[PDB]
Write a protein that binds this ligand. Structure first.
Ligand SMILES: Nc1ncnc2c1ncn2[C@@H]1O[C@H](COP(=O)(O)OP(=O)(O)O)[C@@H](O)[C@H]1O
Ligand SMILES: [Mg+2]
Lengths: 193, 520, 32, 140
């Protein structure tokens, strides 16, 4: 009808649940609410074995599955989107999809807060000025005003500089790739001259 | 730019799935990809179900990313039609490919329409004399009918289509449309240059007096373009039939390539395959294309389509489905071509709806049926002639064999478009000349001539001319060798006089290849 | 969906427990 | 001038989902082109054949036994190309343009795409001059 558009397009039939779950929780402004509510079921499936029986065992009747999920979620002040969500999955037996809806609900939440989790590998641990140099140098790789969240790792095989691991792509600003790319360019230029 | 702009969801060769956020395009509507190396036009084939359409690209999809914005034109592929398309070349999407500027468009028509209805059909059987003996005798063409030339891989169904162009199209008066679907680009350039020389296509300021539109979707094109260029040529013919209201000729070289290009696409549209490996929607695709190529009450389309047969198999479904849509069938066979008989038309497999005694007359139909009876009676004698020898038939049987070997050679003919690679002049034979000559061979007036008197001649006068031309040849032995060359006085110079005239060429010192590769 | 984002769901990330401590108070009678 | 104009290009990663039957399924590579030459971390190249919604079908130019699930696939940014030029004359190359005669790298050469559209109707002319094969059954 008239829903807020998702922050990024996604795959089929499991991310399309999480896109639709994001699109109705945004009209309710309960985006951080149900992302907390989805996470609580993932630990709940870790605790009880009689609850993840309703998602894997193919011999529970589809009446008993949809009654137990309703008979538990009458209460507790869970959001009315999720107690409508879990009744949609219990009627269809798609309770196994919750582990894949949650990882597709995450990057919708991540691209709504416009954060991107990266990883910095340097030769030595940084200064507090070297970090603010690195942040504005690494802000040329994201495509908007994204709040970059760095992680710091150490590799002394790099001889100074940094690499960024965005988990989609990688930029190698280290001096090790600089000197080997330099030597490749030199040894290919004397191949012609 | 949010709505009415979808993005490329996935790319499987020539099949592009485009995802729209809302308000999807219709099926058959054309879309445009933004920021491609050439103009990439997609045409929507299916609604896949989750705000995704599935399209067929009219150019190559090499270089598409799965995020590219795709704008919707809100209409099918619309090509220019009119009288300003005459003497031009168009591709599948209507762009000019002759470098003669933009196409002056009397209208911009969609390439998709329905067939004309039942009440617009016209049932008028008038003959079309082609000048080809086997065609005019045994399977006469309808003036306003659909004509099919069947045969596979070098039997001569392009030389037959060029002889039909040269004979019919020059003496027509209406317009022509050549739709080259899946053929050689060398042949399309040959036809374009040959039509410039003949004045059928004029360039520049006198361009509007041209009589032909070329629409070329040749075999270097991706399968989205070859599957849809016959529709573009059909639309250019349909404008002249409907709006200008006149008789046109549509020559489609290899309408089989339309079926083949849909068969290439349909493996990736996610369908169960039909028989031999073709698409399930073969007969309806071919039918919906062919049912637009008709004569109506408002105009005429004389359609000559060459049909390729795969592996010389007529039971392949793409020729066997084409057989029903055609009025005149001309089946060219490979063994008749290996006998040297050109045009290699099988006379016992080519048919016509004009071969009817109420249409072409009584003596024409009787001569045609008599020639086919002699040829069938000879085909029934092939096994015993092969394994027992000619010397063991009856006398009427070996009269039938001789008359059939005469009328097999007499059905061949030198073509005026083949005179550049044969050396024989082309021989347009009139229809009355064909009927008179074949009646002469059938009754027995010409049991006296040799067999090779009939090979590659025009008509029944030229068999007698060639008979005296080849029986003066066995008497052609002249005296003294007629030398007049032995020591010609100051007419034949010496060799070093002749080497003294030949120019010295300069040999440019080890190929010069690195000096100009570094020029760029 | 991917795998490397889906291995991180083996870690507790709930940041609130008004459901995990509620459901065990009501799951066992419902399944019994 | 090379060192003053030096930009470490953002290498786009992608894991391998599933390899075997001569074709890898590659997770990731969200910006890869159809028909682009991708490079596995084993040094074996590939061609992004089917761009799907959830993976990329990569046909592997070489033995696919060196590809594992979890290998990284770096895209090279260009449609499948071979080095063309006068520096190829005399050289025995494999099907991707890499020399196999052991005579070093192809010097004086330039990459161009292998999938080019043939020249159109207005780009040809008629074939006039002969090409003598030196076989007199052929040339006669
Ligand atoms: N009418 C003809 N007369 C003589 N030779 C012919 C004729 N038609 C075809 N040929 C021979 O066979 C070849 C195939 O001709 P073409 O019409 O191009 O066949 P197709 O288009 O079916 O491959 C020609 O190159 C020529 O050698
Ligand atoms: Mg041909």
């Amino acid at each position: 009808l008239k829903l807020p558009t998702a922050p990024l397009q996604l795959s089929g039939t499991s991310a399309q649940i999480a896109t639709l779950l994001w699109q109705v929780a945004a009209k309710e402004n309960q985006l951080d609410k149900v992302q907390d509510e989805l996470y609580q079921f993932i630990e709940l499936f870790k605790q009880h074995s009689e609850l993840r029986r309703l998602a894997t065992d193919p011999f529970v009747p589809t009446l008993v599955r949809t009654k137990i999920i309703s008979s538990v979620l009458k209460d507790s002040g869970a959001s009315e989107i999720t107690k409508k969500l879990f009744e949609a999955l219990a009627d269809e037996g798609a309770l196994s999809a919750l582990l894949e809806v949650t990882v597709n609900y995450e990057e919708l939440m991540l691209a709504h807060k416009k954060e991107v989790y990266c990883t910095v590998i340097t030769a030595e641990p940084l200064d507090k000025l070297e970090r603010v140099e690195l942040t504005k140098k690494a802000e040329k790789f994201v495509d908007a005003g994204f709040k970059l969240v760095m992680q710091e790792k150490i590799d002394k095989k790099l001889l100074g500089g940094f690499v960024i691991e965005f988990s989609d792509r990688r930029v190698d600003m280290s001096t090790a790739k600089k000197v080997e790319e330099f030597n490749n360019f030199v040894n290919k230029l004397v191949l012609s001259i | 730019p949010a709505i009415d702009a979808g993005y490329v969801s996935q790319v499987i060769g020539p099949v592009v799935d485009v995802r729209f956020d809302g308000e999807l395009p219709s099926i058959l509507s054309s879309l445009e990809v933004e920021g491609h190396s050439v103009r990439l036009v997609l045409e929507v084939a299916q609604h896949m179900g989750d705000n995704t359409v599935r399209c067929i690209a009219m150019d190559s999809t090499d270089g598409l990313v799965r995020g590219q914005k795709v704008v919707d034109t809100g209409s099918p592929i619309k090509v220019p039609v009119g009288r300003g398309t005459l003497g031009r070349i168009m591709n599948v999407i209507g762009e000019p490919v002759d470098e003669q500027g933009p196409i002056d468009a009397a209208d911009i028509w969609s390439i998709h329409r329905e067939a004309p209805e039942f009440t617009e059909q016209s049932t008028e059987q008038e003959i079309l004399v082609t000048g080809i003996k086997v065609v005019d005798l045994l399977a006469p063409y309808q003036r306003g009918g659909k004509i099919g030339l069947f045969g596979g891989a070098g039997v001569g169904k392009t030389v037959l289509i060029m002889e039909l162009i040269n004979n019919v199209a020059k003496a027509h008066g209406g317009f022509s449309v050549f739709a080259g679907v899946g053929e050689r680009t060398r042949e399309g350039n040959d036809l374009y240059r040959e039509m410039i020389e003949s004045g059928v296509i004029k360039l520049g300021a006198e361009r509007g007096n041209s009589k032909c539109t070329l629409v070329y979707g040749q075999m270097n094109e991706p399968p989205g373009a070859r599957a849809r260029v016959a529709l573009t040529g059909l639309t250019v013919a349909e404008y002249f039939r409907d709006i200008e209201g006149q008789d046109v000729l549509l020559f489609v070289d290899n309408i089989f390539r339309f079926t083949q290009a849909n068969s290439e696409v349909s493996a990736l549209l996610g369908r169960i395959p039909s028989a031999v490996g073709y698409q399930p929607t073969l007969a309806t695709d071919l039918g919906g294309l062919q049912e637009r190529i008709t004569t109506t009450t408002k105009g005429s389309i004389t359609s000559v389509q060459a049909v390729y047969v795969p592996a010389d198999d007529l039971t392949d479904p793409a020729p066997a489905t084409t057989f029903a849509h055609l009025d005149a069938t001309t089946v060219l066979s490979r063994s008749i071509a290996e006998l040297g008989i050109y045009p290699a038309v099988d006379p016992l497999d080519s048919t016509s709806r004009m071969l009817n005694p109420n249409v072409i007359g009584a003596e024409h139909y009787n001569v045609a049926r008599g020639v086919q009876k002699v040829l069938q009676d000879y085909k029934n004698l092939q096994d015993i002639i092969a394994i027992l020898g000619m010397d063991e038939l009856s006398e009427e049987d070996k009269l039938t064999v001789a008359r059939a070997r005469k009328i097999q050679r007499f059905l061949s003919q030198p073509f005026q478009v083949a005179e550049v690679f044969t050396g024989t002049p082309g021989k347009y034979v009139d229809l009355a000349d064909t009927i008179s000559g074949f009646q002469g061979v059938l009754t027995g007036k010409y049991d006296d001539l040799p067999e090779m008197a009939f090979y590659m001649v025009g008509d029944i006068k030229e068999v007698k001319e060639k008979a005296d031309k080849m029986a003066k040849d066995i008497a052609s032995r002249k005296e003294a060798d007629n030398k007049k060359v032995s020591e010609e006085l100051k007419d034949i110079p010496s060799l070093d006089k002749l080497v003294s005239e030949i120019k010295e060429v300069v040999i440019e010192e080890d190929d010069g290849l690195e000096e100009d590769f570094k020029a760029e | 969906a991917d795998a490397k984002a889906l291995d991180e769901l083996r870690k507790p990330k709930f940041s609130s427990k008004y459901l995990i401590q509620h459901v065990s108070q009501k799951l066992i009678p419902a399944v019994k | 001038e090379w060192e003053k104009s030096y930009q470490p290009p953002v290498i786009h990663l992608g894991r391998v989902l599933s390899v075997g039957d001569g074709i890898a399924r590659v997770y990731g590579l969200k910006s890869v082109q159809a028909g682009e030459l991708v490079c596995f971390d084993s040094g074996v190249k590939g061609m992004a054949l089917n761009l799907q919604a959830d993976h990329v079908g990569v046909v592997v130019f070489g033995n696919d036994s060196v590809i594992h699930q979890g290998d990284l696939v770096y895209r090279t940014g260009q449609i499948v190309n071979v080095p063309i030029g006068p520096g190829t004359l005399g050289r025995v190359t494999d099907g991707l343009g890499q020399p196999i005669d052991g005579k070093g790298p192809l010097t004086n050469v330039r990459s161009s795409l292998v999938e080019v559209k043939a020249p159109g109707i207005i780009a040809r002319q008629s074939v006039r001059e002969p090409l003598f094969t030196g076989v007199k059954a052929v040339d006669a």
